[PDB]
Symmetry: C2
Subunit: 254 residues, 2 copies
């Protein structure tokens, strides 16, 4: 038995770690420039701004910050994905809850994430985590973040979790709270909902992919919005044949 | 039937296209800086330089260039992966040969690759492809590259293929030929062998991942060496449980 190909890729391969180091190298270069020349706009969309016409929360004079998704963006949930590969019960919500409470010693940093977070703090940039881990598991999540070498997160100040408001897995509310306190100059994530809820809750697989190429959205990638790979679970693992293989690009062997 | 999760991710998801646009945004910013301030070293390793002590071919006064892997770096082989998902015969070498000869109309650019290649040429940077597609299929490959919106490749000048020397799938020989003519200021790929053959032909799954974090190699990612995702086939899809899930990071649900 080999693990699922996506987990071989993400957790086993040098290809995936090189991909992750690349994201954080670009992020650190971007943050350094914005520390020297403060932008007018932050990288967090204004409330009511749609994907057909993106607009952003002003940077103002607010203290500089970077916002990170947690799972598979700064921290690899190796123990849980081991359980999923061994048992085939990755979709078990009670197992994931147990993992939030007890997985502390089975996480690793995403390659380059521990180094990136130290550099941001040396630069005077506040590191803020916005994750859909549950509020009631804030203390074990704090411990897992620290165990992954990512420093000290504080619930309600530099850590925001699902349940901190009544929006569920929608992260726009927490993003608005963060953007009201900080000038967020970089934001990292492995899922499109780590940048805007507008990618989810409706849009199809093909619509979401097209939305990443809307010009005002496309300009963000590697330039304020920084992406980490996740072919293992979540919103990238959707679609039938007609949405994955467009019908003008099909072919049959002899 | 849904396609394999890796293909959903790579070909269907907005996550994957955002990841690819990020790589090319970082590449274009890197190339622009090196066009204004020519480096002393190119991004191609010197012959005999090992992964334990990387050294590079000098840039000199040679004309500026960028080197790209083709398959799943600048061009998506949608038709072939459709065939693999439909038939389960992705590993068929005769089917892949037929695809090299007849897949011309079933390719798409990797998101951002057509735009990136146009920008590099407007900057006066020569675009060179180094691919393990076969020399005998150079003409259909030229047509597929052009069909993907990537411009005109020329065999032996800006296109180098497997069989152009007696090294097989090893690309170091072609890299040395390119580096002798150009100052290569950026190199893109989806496989570690698109940067050095020293990652392959021996090193285990865990050894190759560690090698990407050797400091002189780690400095390259997003900073001369640019990586595109491929959780669908190739050297990232290897390893048993003990190499994917390190034994200090294991966990079992209640
Ligand atoms: N391999 C996986 N398959 C399904 N869900 C996963 C996996 N890894 C983590 N999860 C998370 O576990 C929960 C239950 O599916 C969700 O929060 C989901 O994001
Ligand atoms: N899904 C796939 N599975 C296996 N090989 C593939 C796949 N897609 C492309 N290839 C290529 O097809 C050839 C036969 O395995 C190799 O050159 C390999 O790189
Ligand atoms: Mg996440
Ligand atoms: Mg390739």
């Amino acid at each position: 038995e080999t693990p699922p190909a996506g987990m071989q890729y993400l957790y086993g391969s040098g290809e995936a770690s090189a991909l992750s180091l690349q994201a954080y190298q670009a992020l650190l270069a971007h943050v350094a420039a914005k520390v020297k020349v403060r932008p007018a706009d932050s990288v967090i969309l204004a409330e009511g701004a749609g994907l057909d016409d993106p607009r952003f929360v002003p940077c103002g004079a607010k203290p500089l910050a970077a916002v990170f998704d947690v799972d598979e963006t700064v921290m690899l949930n190796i123990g849980y994905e081991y359980h999923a590969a061994r048992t085939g019960r990755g979709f078990d919500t009670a197992a994931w809850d147990a993992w939030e409470r007890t997985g502390e010693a089975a996480v690793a940093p995403v390659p380059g994430a521990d180094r990136m977070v130290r550099a941001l703090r040396q630069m005077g940039v506040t590191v803020v985590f916005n994750t859909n881990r549950a509020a009631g598991n804030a203390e074990p999540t704090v411990r897992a973040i620290k165990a992954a070498g990512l420093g000290d997160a504080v619930h309600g100040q530099t850590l925001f979790l699902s349940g901190d408001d009544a929006m569920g897995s929608r992260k726009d509310g927490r993003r608005a709270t963060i953007a009201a306190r900080y000038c967020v100059i970089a934001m990292g994530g492995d899922q499109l909902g780590d940048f805007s809820d507008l990618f989810n809750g409706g849009p199809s697989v093909t619509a979401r992919r097209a939305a990443t190429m809307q010009p005002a959205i496309a300009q963000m990638w590697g330039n304020g919005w920084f992406v980490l790979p996740n072919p293992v679970y979540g919103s990238g693992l959707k679609g039938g044949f007609d949405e994955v293989f467009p019908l003008d690009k099909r072919w049959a062997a002899p």
